[PDB]
Amino acid sequence: GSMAHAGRTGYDNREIVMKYIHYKLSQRGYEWDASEVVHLTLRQAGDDFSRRYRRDFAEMSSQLHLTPFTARGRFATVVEELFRDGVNWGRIVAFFEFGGVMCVESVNREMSPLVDNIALWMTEYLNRHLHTWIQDNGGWDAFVELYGPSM
């Protein structure tokens, strides 16, 4: 099975989102559930992103102000600005990290049902707005090739 891109369908992106969120929550000891080198590379890339981010900025959750009524709009506003002038793998990693932060903060703030919603919002945004860019730019395979190496 080497003729086509790894994780080349929306169903695969969904799995990718669910595994990512499960991991981000597990790092905080919160248990939740709803391509293998792809999941591994994204874990690594997001962790390395977070490390760099935190060197320069305060905790990402310090500027969120989550409520159940405003969470979807907060998500959409942030992500729409993130990709307003374009897409690249670094911004896609930023997208996963932001979604993970939304989920962690939801559980922290005793709004844990929002996790399931955030996972759906991420999956939909990925499939509606990032997936065709991903296919046009070498698939998750290209991402693995570029971000596979540490740092």
């Binding site: 320069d56 500027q63 600005e81 793998w89 670094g90």
Partner: peptide, 21 residues
């Protein structure tokens, strides 16, 4: 705060992009 958050995500994202290449 939301605008600033997005900008922080975007630039850190762009940095990462550039380092990979």
């Amino acid at each position: 705060d939301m605008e600033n958050l997005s900008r922080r995500l975007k630039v850190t994202g762009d940095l990462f992009d550039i380092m990979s290449g």
